[PDB]
């Protein structure tokens, strides 16, 4: 039983300057690496738990709290 609590600094101004930079790496791959880390953590053991929080500029809203994709439904 383990509990990873990812916190992703979703500054819309910073990732906005990153997406106007026209780089390779934008917010989509950031949140996708977050979700692949989350599914990996739930994947390593059955008892693991996950919670993903996104600090916005004015709010701490949580992100986290059939199988068409083929992944586990949960």
């Amino acid at each position: 039983l383990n509990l990873l609590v990812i916190v992703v600094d979703a500054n819309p101004i910073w990732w906005g300057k990153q997406a106007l930079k026209e780089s390779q790496f934008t917010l989509s791959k950031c949140i996708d690496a977050v979700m692949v880390l989350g599914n990996s953590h739930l994947f390593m053991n059955r008892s693991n738990k996950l919670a993903v929080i996104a600090s916005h500029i004015q709010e701490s809203r949580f992100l986290y709290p059939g199988s068409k994709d083929g992944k586990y439904e949960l």
Binding site: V36, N39, S40, F43, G66, S67, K68, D69, G70, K71, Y72
Partner: peptide, 13 residues
């Protein structure tokens, strides 16, 4: 990688 990500088959349940 099909067990962790999207897949081409469609499971058993």
């Amino acid at each position: 990688r099909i067990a962790l990500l999207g897949g081409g088959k469609a499971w058993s349940d």
